[PDB]
Scaffold this active site. Structure first.
Site, PDB file in Angstrom:
ATOM      1  N   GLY B 141       0.825  -1.217   0.000  1.00 18.58           N
ATOM      2  CA  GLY B 141       0.000   0.000   0.000  1.00 18.58           C
ATOM      3  C   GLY B 141       0.850   1.253   0.000  1.00 18.58           C
ATOM      4  O   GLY B 141       0.429   2.237  -0.598  1.00 18.58           O
ATOM      5  N   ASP B 161      -7.724  -0.739   6.105  1.00 14.65           N
ATOM      6  CA  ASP B 161      -8.116  -1.974   6.803  1.00 14.65           C
ATOM      7  C   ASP B 161      -6.874  -2.860   6.886  1.00 14.65           C
ATOM      8  O   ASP B 161      -6.840  -3.938   6.273  1.00 14.65           O
ATOM      9  CB  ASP B 161      -9.248  -2.680   6.060  1.00 14.65           C
TER      10      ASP B 161
HETATM   11  C1  LIG Z   1      -6.994  -9.163   6.702  1.00 12.20           C
HETATM   12  S1  LIG Z   1      -7.186  -7.394   6.599  1.00 12.20           S
HETATM   13  C2  LIG Z   1      -5.506  -6.814   6.898  1.00 12.20           C
HETATM   14  C3  LIG Z   1      -4.671  -6.927   5.639  1.00 12.20           C
HETATM   15  O1  LIG Z   1      -3.590  -5.957   5.700  1.00 12.20           O
HETATM   16  C4  LIG Z   1      -2.715  -6.418   4.707  1.00 12.20           C
HETATM   17  N1  LIG Z   1      -1.544  -5.581   4.689  1.00 12.20           N
HETATM   18  C5  LIG Z   1      -0.608  -5.450   5.674  1.00 12.20           C
HETATM   19  N2  LIG Z   1       0.323  -4.592   5.377  1.00 12.20           N
HETATM   20  C6  LIG Z   1      -0.049  -4.109   4.129  1.00 12.20           C
HETATM   21  C7  LIG Z   1       0.567  -3.174   3.288  1.00 12.20           C
HETATM   22  N3  LIG Z   1       1.692  -2.569   3.651  1.00 12.20           N
HETATM   23  N4  LIG Z   1       0.000  -2.946   2.077  1.00 12.20           N
HETATM   24  C8  LIG Z   1      -1.127  -3.614   1.780  1.00 12.20           C
HETATM   25  N5  LIG Z   1      -1.806  -4.499   2.509  1.00 12.20           N
HETATM   26  C9  LIG Z   1      -1.190  -4.714   3.682  1.00 12.20           C
HETATM   27  C10 LIG Z   1      -2.498  -7.867   5.079  1.00 12.20           C
HETATM   28  O2  LIG Z   1      -1.889  -8.522   4.002  1.00 12.20           O
HETATM   29  C11 LIG Z   1      -3.950  -8.276   5.383  1.00 12.20           C
HETATM   30  O3  LIG Z   1      -4.527  -9.023   4.316  1.00 12.20           O
END
Ligand SMILES: CSC[C@H]1O[C@@H](n2cnc3c(N)ncnc32)[C@H](O)[C@@H]1O
Ligand SMILES: CSC[C@H]1O[C@@H](n2cnc3c(N)ncnc32)[C@H](O)[C@@H]1O
Ligand SMILES: CSC[C@H]1O[C@@H](n2cnc3c(N)ncnc32)[C@H](O)[C@@H]1O
Ligand SMILES: CSC[C@H]1O[C@@H](n2cnc3c(N)ncnc32)[C@H](O)[C@@H]1O
Ligand SMILES: NCCCCNCCCNCCCN
Lengths: 286, 286, 286, 286
Positions: B141, B161
């Site tokens: 992200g 989330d």
């Molecule tokens: C289950 S909802 C939480 C989600 O956050 C996601 N997650 C954690 N860190 C990141 C990040 N840096 N970028 C995108 N998704 C993330 C995890 O892979 C998980 O599926």
């Protein structure tokens, strides 16, 4: 990770809490129940009855303020208050804050809970047991209410702060339709009852039995809940009213009654009241 | 008493949950996290990441509706939605219910969470991954947002989330002041951000860090919480707004937007909205 | 604390083991018992029956070699061997190593334990089930022994590898005085019986019942124990002999019988034999 | 599950013990370690240091007899004895039983362990602390041994009864090659050292480090183990000797030395000695 000394607090039977214990202050097998007073790392000092945390120093004000103030604030002039249970004296402490109160009676079946709370849980009672307006009676609340009917005693607000309906043999007769009919008989015409009713999510059947009992005896019923971390759940409250609707109070009216009555709180406010009246209770959604 | 197969869910470090497991569906050590899908007696099917329950069949709708709808209902016409995380697809499911949405992008770092959720958690995504309005992107992200700034992409509502700020190395860069500044740069002028912020009671320092990050970048900030039984706590949410104040919405305005937009919910309503805006968040009181 | 997925293995009822589980291979409700085959971090692959670990990859050789070889090495020419239980096939594997053995019969009540062990626990049986000298019978061992008396069948060595005497309803009739009398009737005049007898430290009453049963039927009785890490205790063995005294064997005589018979072991030797015959069993000392 | 009050005793990290606690007698955070004295249902009264049971009323005699008597019985005339650790005073109690002993010095770093053991664990020390032949010194054992070298002190038998090599920062300097060289310098030329060395099955690397340290400094080395139920494992012992070989002692010679020296035991005998010298130590077999 939560040891080396741990409380295994039952929650649902399929979930339990593991709570780190720093110290045990007292253990007492009373004729009614096993009493433990202990220090927890997360929650500070706790009262435990038959393995269930009743109250903790760090969150009891969430429980006791939510149990007492919505009912007391809904009554326009609560003068005579009856508490069933409330062994640690915090329910009495919150009720006595209302300057309208002239007589508060607290009835607990277990003299050991009251005496051990007096000694080991001073931040709960904060002198409530010694208030000139307060009378502490050691009696089964069922018997006390039967004797109050015969004497034709009447109260403005009745607060039930008993052990859980889903676990507690000693409280079971006080959670029935028939007992709520007896409660109505010792209320003034504009009276309010409030009780803790366990948890609607984990114990829906026991919660629903209490709710049907209150709805059969009182025309106005509010349901509200508050997360108590030390319990592992949002405790459910059921408030039964003969005249006044807690849903009708605005934040400003609640805050004005608290101010006029000299009521100081850590949590309860007009906005909290509005939130409690508007948040539906938790159920299993699948 | 839970067993013989049990999940030990950390909660605070001084409190843990013991949850009876009926079946393990899948275990996957991804490069990012350990993934478990299991059946629990109390909560039904769960997603677990690095020992923490992310979502359960019996209460995920409390989490996902509380995360999404207050922000979406506060925006008068949310057309472009970005979700960071939301691996099980339920955040996407809730956002897509708003008939105003034309484009929803969901960005999760871990393809194994998405694929295992697609297969083993169909009641979570309910086809959201295949909605023509939805794009699922497997990317960090942090990287996605940097590339969105350079492309000058802009969104009406951004929903974070992610895994918990108090536990998750993989999400830590997305919870900083600097990251919320980057989020503001990919919001339209009337945009809103919402993030889960762990728990204010058990993890106040990590909660406060996220709150200061949002307050430094957004002039309107609302804080609210909801008890999620399968988590053992009331999850904290922080909503950052550039123009519209969620505190200003009445129940009627919320319910009219839901109706106009074709949004059906199990939990969220105008009254829930009012309660969330009025309930103070939990802290240790002693 | 070990997790996130944990086996709660009962030990004494006032002590339990928490064992980290990496994977569940199979769960089967048989007509007789609940079967779990699982991977543990400490012990590798395990067979679990009604919550109790029966055997682990990392330490089963301690159990099976200690159960089998002292009895087999004490008999000067064991040709006909009967095994009661031994569902995973490791008891049979150890007995078959003795070149003197012409006929080995293994009798387990539970076809699911045998078939699931054949598939999921190959390092236990190591082909023993398919040895031309071996016969696998699915029958209650009580019934098999009654039918063996009527047929006048006779064995040199009888090995009881049953579920625990302190927990297992299905095995309880095979641990009585009366059952050991039946065993004596299907032994040759120089025959030896060996049984696991649970644990003398945690279950002294059940251990003593088995011991009194063997002492009432056999003139030579040896008691010995071995720490099995995956059990959380030193398993107790009771060896009943009609002629030959295992206490009389020297390390050199044991090592010569092993060599002459082509017996290769991971643990058992003449020196181990001497140690087992000389180490008293554990009891509560206060 | 064992509760409601439980000790979570770490064992390996992937196995832990859950032990029912009937009472907590004392909790002391010393600068060196957390000290707990408690009553357990299975093991009676226990000393716990940093979460690890050190000794229990029901099985400490297995530990203390096995630690002391093989070394003391191997020395033909042990007159001067040094104990490092042994805070509860049971190691000293066992050493003093030898009528040859004129001077026994016990050195523990933690005055709180000794004083809390004196008060709450009388069945451990049984007056040993007050024996005219005994000197109890509160000092770091590392410092005491350096000062013993400078004073040119010499002992016949040195017993190390320290906290575990795999867990204890306070003892780590006393488990090195270099420390065993210092021990050799304060032994008479026919001197013997014995130390507990944790557990070879669960902590092989830490066990092997201690073993190599002793083998580098002593020409005769014996390894033996004993199951201690309250520990969850067979404790490993390493005996280093400059002249006398414990493997050479017969049961009759051991029993005659015990009789001549007035040594009464609950467990240790010539036959136990023979078993300890012949039983290989436990390792993971796959
Ligand atoms: C289950 S909802 C939480 C989600 O956050 C996601 N997650 C954690 N860190 C990141 C990040 N840096 N970028 C995108 N998704 C993330 C995890 O892979 C998980 O599926
Ligand atoms: C600790 S607050 C709960 C209290 O409920 C009390 N209680 C339980 N059952 C009854 C009953 N039948 N009558 C009065 N008090 C009760 C217990 O003694 C306890 O102190
Ligand atoms: C797992 S090794 C022990 C075996 O003893 C078996 N067992 C228990 N009761 C009996 C019985 N009555 N007869 C034969 N085998 C039995 C169980 O099925 C198990 O496989
Ligand atoms: C309970 S028996 C073990 C004892 O070892 C002691 N101990 C640990 N490290 C040292 C050390 N460096 N010197 C002396 N005693 C020690 C602890 O205080 C404890 O009482
Ligand atoms: N989980 C296993 C507990 C291990 C405790 N280790 C034993 C410590 C030995 N030293 C002190 C013994 C009492 N004198």
């Amino acid at each position: 990770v939560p040891g080396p000394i741990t409380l295994i607090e039952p929650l649902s039977g399929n979930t339990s809490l593991l709570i780190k214990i720093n110290a045990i202050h007292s253990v007492k097998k009373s004729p009614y129940q096993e009493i433990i007073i202990a220090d927890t790392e997360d929650y500070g000092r706790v009262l435990i009855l038959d393995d269930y945390i009743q109250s903790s120093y760090v969150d009891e004000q969430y429980y006791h303020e939510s149990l007492v103030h919505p009912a007391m604030a809904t009554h326009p002039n609560p003068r005579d208050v009856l508490i069933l249970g409330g062994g640690e004296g915090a329910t009495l402490r919150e009720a006595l804050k209302h300057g309208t109160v002239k007589r508060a009676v607290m009835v607990d079946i277990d003299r050991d809970v009251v005496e051990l709370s007096r000694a080991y849980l001073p931040q709960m009672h904060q002198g409530a047991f010694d208030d000139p307006r307060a009378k502490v009676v050691i009696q089964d609340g069922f018997v006390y209410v039967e004797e109050a009917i015969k004497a034709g005693d009447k109260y403005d607000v009745i607060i039930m702060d008993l052990t859980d309906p889903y676990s507690s043999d000693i409280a079971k007769q006080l959670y029935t339709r028939e007992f709520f009919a007896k409660i109505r008989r010792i209320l003034n015409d504009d009276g309010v009852v409030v009780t803790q009713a366990g948890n609607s999510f984990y114990f829906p059947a026991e919660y629903d039995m209490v709710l049907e009992g209150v709805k059969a005896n009182f025309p106005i019923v509010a349901e509200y809940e508050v997360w108590i971390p030390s319990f592992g759940y949002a405790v459910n409250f059921i408030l039964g009213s003969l005249r006044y609707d807690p849903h009708a109070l605005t934040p400003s009216e609640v805050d004005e009654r608290l101010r006029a009555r000299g009521v100081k709180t850590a949590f309860y406010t007009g906005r909290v009241h509005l939130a409690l009246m508007n948040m539906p209770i938790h159920r299993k959604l699948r």
